[PDB]
Write a protein that binds this ligand. Sequence first.
Ligand SMILES: CCCCCCCCCCCCCCCC(=O)OCC(COC(=O)CCCCCCCCCCCCCCC)OC(=O)CCCCCCCCCCCCCCC
Length: 196
Amino acid sequence: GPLPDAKPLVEEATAQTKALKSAHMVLTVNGKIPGLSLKTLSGDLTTNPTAATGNVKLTLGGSDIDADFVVFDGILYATLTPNQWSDFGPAADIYDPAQVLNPDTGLANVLANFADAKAEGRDTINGQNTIRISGKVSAQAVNQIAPPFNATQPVPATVWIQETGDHQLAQAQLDRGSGNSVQMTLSKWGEKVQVT
Ligand SMILES: CCCCCCCCCCCCCCCC(=O)OCC(COC(=O)CCCCCCCCCCCCCCC)OC(=O)CCCCCCCCCCCCCCC
């Protein structure tokens, strides 16, 4: 049947995202984004205070490493060899994961700077009906959430917003062209992170 108007849905998702404290996130990098050596990540994030835990697949020196990670008390830790925790210092010197849910600079700021929104279709994301929406995100909003994009123009993007219910952002993708793109799927909004 007919699609809703994207614009009110984006506005509603913006407000919902600003109110978020925590979520489960799955992040995938498709192709190659210069200065991003991550391939995948899956984890749980809470904010105020910031903590995160999960697993990451990343490339270091031409090799893919699977690692568990914890961010706790500003500090990033990861197991670059199995069951061995290394301390990598302040998480903020690499990337503070709270930035993803910062209401001024994170996903909500992406949504508020998502231009030309148009509903394209319906898709299931994690068992929920969502509206797939195309648009373009400002360079400045992209660079603030994902510095390695190094955008000097608007970035084509797709968002998937819950059709009913709370209208959360279920998924977002930023396309750097060719077959190079970053996507995040969010779920379990307001989960207790558990702790670390
Ligand atoms: C809608 C889309 C939403 C997108 C939201 C998030 C987008 C991603 C944010 C961009 C990350 C920017 C961080 C710098 C990029 C980096 O990779 O450095 C490149 C250097 C090579 O680049 C350079 O040459 C120099 C950069 C200096 C980096 C120093 C590295 C020190 C080595 C030790 C790190 C190993 C532990 C990492 C475990 C995570 O080699 C490295 O890869 C080593 C560092 C790996 C960092 C992984 C960052 C994790 C992203 C977390 C956000 C996801 C949400 C979290 C939810 C829980």
